[PDB]
RNA sequence: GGGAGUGAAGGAGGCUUCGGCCGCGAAACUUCACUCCC
């Protein structure tokens, strides 16, 4: 694909035949994140599973040791004293079904959204099609839906991430910012990798982490050894 | 070796001959995968 000079340059910096260590990679990050903003670091792993087999779906969440160095605007749809509990946990905008029409008018000033199970009827059906493209819709297996809404909200704002393999058997997640210190990123990179392994399916066949990579928003990639 | 599509992820910037072009919509761009084609 037609690349820019900025990127053609980044290519000369990494060796595609070399399997870098989690730490070597963590040091390249700075030298690759040359876009005109604080690029995000990410890890991509091709998983030894059968995406078609519902029970071999790698899906979960995990807390990162050094956050995502990113501010997360969480919205909280709720019912009862739960509202008070959400406001307490630290959500940016708390509310009830009313939020539903507010969003149907064009309000998308949030990054995340959580909700108590008892509002999901209205939230599910109504906000379903408008929130669906951005992957904003609250879900139980996503960790976005729970009565312990303050704990869920507390967690997100602390740099907790989600991860679900895609239909091709690959899984991806952000693990920090290019501004992070080399080793902080590394702690974060091992964290996510360990999260994946603790979610290896029972009937999963063969080598689980077939490959694992490190990259930034606009830079190239470097294959790493998951156990470094 | 190159041209593309599809999925997921990251993403508010990306490219430029400096004329502007593209993107902040799912959409630019980039990554890992699933295919098509030359
Ligand atoms: K990328």
Short mmCIF file of C-alpha atoms (C1' of nucleotides) and ligand atoms in Angstrom, two decimals:
data_model
loop_
_atom_site.label_atom_id
_atom_site.label_comp_id
_atom_site.label_asym_id
_atom_site.label_seq_id
_atom_site.Cartn_x
_atom_site.Cartn_y
_atom_site.Cartn_z
CA UNK A 1 0.00 0.00 0.00
CA UNK A 2 1.06 3.59 -0.80
CA UNK A 3 2.78 4.80 2.38
CA UNK A 4 4.02 8.23 3.37
CA UNK A 5 7.68 9.17 3.83
CA UNK A 6 7.15 9.39 7.59
CA UNK A 7 6.20 5.71 7.53
CA UNK A 8 8.69 4.64 4.85
CA UNK A 9 11.18 5.96 7.37
CA UNK A 10 9.80 3.98 10.29
CA UNK A 11 10.34 0.83 8.23
CA UNK A 12 14.10 1.27 8.27
CA UNK A 13 13.87 1.23 12.07
CA UNK A 14 12.47 -2.28 12.60
CA UNK A 15 13.53 -5.72 11.32
CA UNK A 16 10.52 -7.84 10.19
CA UNK A 17 12.50 -11.11 10.43
CA UNK A 18 13.45 -10.47 14.03
CA UNK A 19 11.34 -11.56 16.97
CA UNK A 20 11.87 -8.75 19.45
CA UNK A 21 11.63 -9.13 23.18
CA UNK A 22 8.72 -7.49 25.04
CA UNK A 23 11.34 -5.05 26.30
CA UNK A 24 13.23 -4.38 23.07
CA UNK A 25 9.85 -3.53 21.49
CA UNK A 26 8.98 -1.24 24.40
CA UNK A 27 12.01 0.86 23.48
CA UNK A 28 11.21 1.09 19.77
CA UNK A 29 7.75 2.54 20.59
CA UNK A 30 9.04 6.08 21.02
CA UNK A 31 10.99 5.99 17.73
CA UNK A 32 7.95 4.77 15.83
CA UNK A 33 5.20 6.82 17.24
CA UNK A 34 6.06 9.76 15.00
CA UNK A 35 2.51 10.88 14.19
CA UNK A 36 1.63 14.43 15.20
CA UNK A 37 0.00 13.35 18.47
CA UNK A 38 0.59 10.97 21.41
CA UNK A 39 0.09 7.66 19.65
CA UNK A 40 -1.45 4.72 21.49
CA UNK A 41 0.45 1.46 21.90
CA UNK A 42 -1.25 -1.82 21.05
CA UNK A 43 -0.84 -5.56 21.04
CA UNK A 44 -2.22 -7.93 18.42
CA UNK A 45 -2.37 -11.68 18.91
CA UNK A 46 -3.44 -14.36 16.44
CA UNK A 47 -5.13 -16.95 18.65
CA UNK A 48 -5.04 -20.70 18.27
CA UNK A 49 -8.79 -21.15 18.30
CA UNK A 50 -11.76 -21.76 16.06
CA UNK A 51 -13.73 -18.49 16.01
CA UNK A 52 -16.73 -20.49 14.73
CA UNK A 53 -16.75 -22.60 17.89
CA UNK A 54 -18.71 -20.44 20.35
CA UNK A 55 -16.91 -22.08 23.33
CA UNK A 56 -13.42 -21.23 21.99
CA UNK A 57 -14.16 -17.49 22.04
CA UNK A 58 -11.50 -15.58 23.96
CA UNK A 59 -13.33 -12.73 25.62
CA UNK A 60 -12.70 -10.82 28.85
CA UNK A 61 -11.28 -7.75 30.59
CA UNK A 62 -8.19 -6.99 32.64
CA UNK A 63 -6.75 -4.15 34.68
CA UNK A 64 -3.55 -2.51 33.48
CA UNK A 65 -0.73 -1.75 36.02
CA UNK A 66 -0.08 1.69 34.55
CA UNK A 67 -3.42 2.64 33.05
CA UNK A 68 -3.96 3.68 29.43
CA UNK A 69 -2.63 7.20 30.04
CA UNK A 70 -5.96 8.24 28.55
CA UNK A 71 -8.96 9.96 30.12
CA UNK A 72 -12.13 7.86 29.74
CA UNK A 73 -15.52 9.67 29.69
CA UNK A 74 -17.96 7.17 31.17
CA UNK A 75 -21.73 7.56 31.00
CA UNK A 76 -23.97 5.81 33.53
CA UNK A 77 -27.56 4.83 32.69
CA UNK A 78 -29.25 3.66 35.89
CA UNK A 79 -32.29 3.23 38.11
CA UNK A 80 -32.87 4.01 41.87
CA UNK A 81 -30.11 4.80 44.44
CA UNK A 82 -27.84 3.27 41.80
CA UNK A 83 -27.73 6.71 40.29
CA UNK A 84 -26.23 8.05 43.53
CA UNK A 85 -23.80 5.10 43.53
CA UNK A 86 -22.69 5.86 39.94
CA UNK A 87 -22.21 9.55 40.65
CA UNK A 88 -20.07 8.47 43.60
CA UNK A 89 -17.89 6.03 41.69
CA UNK A 90 -16.94 9.00 39.52
CA UNK A 91 -18.89 8.74 36.27
CA UNK A 92 -18.85 11.84 34.04
CA UNK A 93 -22.55 11.88 33.29
CA UNK A 94 -25.04 9.93 35.39
CA UNK A 95 -28.74 9.57 34.57
CA UNK A 96 -31.77 7.38 33.89
CA UNK A 97 -33.91 6.55 30.84
CA UNK A 98 -34.01 10.31 30.20
CA UNK A 99 -30.46 10.00 28.87
CA UNK A 100 -32.01 7.82 26.18
CA UNK A 101 -33.85 10.58 24.39
CA UNK A 102 -30.91 12.92 25.00
CA UNK A 103 -28.77 10.50 23.00
CA UNK A 104 -31.47 10.18 20.32
CA UNK A 105 -31.12 13.95 19.76
CA UNK A 106 -27.42 13.62 18.99
CA UNK A 107 -25.41 13.59 22.21
CA UNK A 108 -22.21 11.50 21.98
CA UNK A 109 -19.88 13.30 24.37
CA UNK A 110 -18.71 10.17 26.10
CA UNK A 111 -16.14 7.46 25.55
CA UNK A 112 -17.81 4.72 27.58
CA UNK A 113 -21.14 3.86 29.06
CA UNK A 114 -22.23 1.49 31.79
CA UNK A 115 -25.73 0.62 33.06
CA UNK A 116 -27.55 -1.31 35.79
CA UNK A 117 -29.26 -4.44 34.33
CA UNK A 118 -32.70 -3.00 35.15
CA UNK A 119 -32.54 -0.26 32.49
CA UNK A 120 -31.13 -2.48 29.73
CA UNK A 121 -34.58 -3.14 28.36
CA UNK A 122 -34.96 0.49 27.31
CA UNK A 123 -31.23 0.95 26.68
CA UNK A 124 -30.95 -2.24 24.71
CA UNK A 125 -33.75 -1.76 22.20
CA UNK A 126 -33.78 2.03 21.94
CA UNK A 127 -30.08 3.00 21.96
CA UNK A 128 -29.24 -0.19 20.12
CA UNK A 129 -28.83 1.11 16.59
CA UNK A 130 -27.31 4.52 17.34
CA UNK A 131 -24.67 3.14 19.79
CA UNK A 132 -23.94 -0.10 17.90
CA UNK A 133 -21.31 1.37 15.32
CA UNK A 134 -19.18 2.86 18.05
CA UNK A 135 -19.41 -0.24 20.18
CA UNK A 136 -20.89 1.92 22.92
CA UNK A 137 -23.74 -0.38 23.89
CA UNK A 138 -23.54 -1.73 27.49
CA UNK A 139 -23.05 -5.51 27.75
CA UNK A 140 -22.78 -8.16 30.56
CA UNK A 141 -19.77 -10.07 29.14
CA UNK A 142 -18.19 -6.70 28.32
CA UNK A 143 -18.25 -5.70 31.95
CA UNK A 144 -20.41 -2.70 31.15
CA UNK A 145 -23.51 -3.91 32.77
CA UNK A 146 -23.72 -4.72 36.48
CA UNK A 147 -25.47 -3.67 39.68
CA UNK A 148 -22.03 -3.04 41.10
CA UNK A 149 -22.01 -0.12 38.76
CA UNK A 150 -19.68 1.95 40.99
CA UNK A 151 -17.14 -0.75 41.04
CA UNK A 152 -17.41 -1.14 37.24
CA UNK A 153 -17.10 2.64 36.78
CA UNK A 154 -14.27 2.81 39.33
CA UNK A 155 -12.38 0.16 37.29
CA UNK A 156 -12.74 1.64 33.77
CA UNK A 157 -11.40 5.04 34.92
CA UNK A 158 -8.43 3.11 36.34
CA UNK A 159 -7.36 1.88 32.95
CA UNK A 160 -9.22 -1.42 32.65
CA UNK A 161 -9.45 -2.78 29.09
CA UNK A 162 -11.69 -5.18 27.18
CA UNK A 163 -10.69 -7.82 24.71
CA UNK A 164 -12.64 -10.20 22.51
CA UNK A 165 -11.19 -12.23 19.65
CA UNK A 166 -12.52 -11.30 16.26
CA UNK A 167 -14.22 -13.59 13.73
CA UNK A 168 -10.81 -14.31 12.18
CA UNK A 169 -9.28 -15.58 15.38
CA UNK A 170 -7.24 -12.50 16.11
CA UNK A 171 -7.46 -10.26 19.17
CA UNK A 172 -6.30 -6.70 19.78
CA UNK A 173 -6.12 -4.16 22.57
CA UNK A 174 -4.42 -0.87 23.49
CA UNK A 175 -1.83 -1.15 26.29
CA UNK A 176 -0.67 2.42 26.89
CA UNK A 177 0.64 5.57 25.18
CA UNK A 178 3.85 6.16 23.24
CA UNK A 179 4.71 8.74 25.88
CA UNK A 180 4.76 6.07 28.64
CA UNK A 181 8.22 5.10 29.96
CA UNK A 182 9.61 2.04 28.04
CA UNK A 183 9.22 -0.34 30.97
CA UNK A 184 5.79 0.86 32.12
CA UNK A 185 4.54 -0.09 28.64
CA UNK A 186 6.27 -3.43 29.08
CA UNK A 187 4.54 -4.12 32.38
CA UNK A 188 1.32 -3.29 30.57
CA UNK A 189 2.19 -5.55 27.62
CA UNK A 190 2.85 -8.61 29.79
CA UNK A 191 -0.38 -7.90 31.71
CA UNK A 192 -2.58 -8.12 28.63
CA UNK A 193 -0.74 -11.20 27.37
CA UNK A 194 -1.25 -12.95 30.70
CA UNK A 195 -4.96 -11.98 30.59
CA UNK A 196 -5.28 -13.79 27.25
CA UNK A 197 -3.61 -16.97 28.52
CA UNK A 198 -5.86 -17.10 31.59
CA UNK A 199 -8.68 -17.21 29.05
CA UNK A 200 -7.36 -20.04 26.88
CA UNK A 201 -10.45 -22.15 26.10
CA UNK A 202 -10.79 -25.73 27.29
CA UNK A 203 -11.30 -27.33 23.88
CA UNK A 204 -8.84 -24.91 22.32
CA UNK A 205 -6.52 -26.77 19.98
CA UNK A 206 -2.83 -26.22 19.41
CA UNK A 207 -0.57 -23.29 20.21
CA UNK A 208 -2.69 -20.57 21.76
CA UNK A 209 -0.72 -17.39 21.05
CA UNK A 210 0.30 -18.23 17.47
CA UNK A 211 1.88 -14.79 17.24
CA UNK A 212 1.83 -11.54 19.16
CA UNK A 213 2.73 -8.04 18.03
CA UNK A 214 3.42 -4.56 19.29
CA UNK A 215 2.67 -1.37 17.39
CA UNK A 216 1.36 2.20 17.77
CA UNK A 217 -1.54 4.03 16.14
CA UNK A 218 0.32 5.04 12.96
CA UNK A 219 3.58 3.18 13.10
CA UNK A 220 4.51 -0.29 11.72
CA UNK A 221 4.78 -3.43 13.85
CA UNK A 222 7.21 -5.66 15.68
CA UNK A 223 6.65 -9.33 16.47
CA UNK A 224 7.51 -10.18 20.07
CA UNK A 225 8.13 -13.18 22.30
CA UNK A 226 5.07 -13.37 24.58
CA UNK A 227 7.29 -14.71 27.35
CA UNK A 228 9.77 -11.91 27.93
"C1'" G B 1 6.45 -8.11 -5.60
"C1'" G B 2 2.15 -5.27 -6.21
"C1'" G B 3 -3.45 -3.96 -6.39
"C1'" A B 4 -7.83 -4.48 -3.42
"C1'" G B 5 -12.09 -6.26 -0.22
"C1'" U B 6 -13.71 -8.09 4.57
"C1'" G B 7 -13.46 -8.50 10.11
"C1'" A B 8 -11.60 -6.72 14.58
"C1'" A B 9 -8.39 -3.00 16.95
"C1'" G B 10 -6.03 1.59 17.51
"C1'" G B 11 -7.19 6.31 15.94
"C1'" A B 12 -7.92 12.65 15.52
"C1'" G B 13 -5.37 13.45 12.59
"C1'" G B 14 -3.07 11.32 7.45
"C1'" C B 15 -0.73 12.63 2.72
"C1'" U B 16 1.24 16.51 -0.20
"C1'" U B 17 4.19 18.37 -6.11
"C1'" C B 18 2.57 23.06 -0.76
"C1'" G B 19 -2.06 23.85 -5.64
"C1'" G B 20 -4.69 21.08 -2.32
"C1'" C B 21 -6.51 16.13 -1.54
"C1'" C B 22 -8.54 12.64 2.53
"C1'" G B 23 -10.35 11.98 7.61
"C1'" C B 24 -12.51 13.61 12.86
"C1'" G B 25 -19.97 9.32 9.99
"C1'" A B 26 -18.77 2.47 9.88
"C1'" A B 27 -15.23 4.99 6.51
"C1'" A B 28 -8.53 8.80 6.67
"C1'" C B 29 -4.36 6.33 8.37
"C1'" U B 30 -2.13 2.08 10.76
"C1'" U B 31 -1.96 -3.24 12.93
"C1'" C B 32 -3.23 -8.26 13.24
"C1'" A B 33 -5.99 -11.70 10.85
"C1'" C B 34 -9.84 -13.89 6.69
"C1'" U B 35 -10.31 -14.06 1.47
"C1'" C B 36 -10.04 -12.10 -3.94
"C1'" C B 37 -6.91 -10.66 -7.89
"C1'" C B 38 -2.52 -9.22 -10.87
K1 LIG C 1 -1.84 0.48 14.43
#
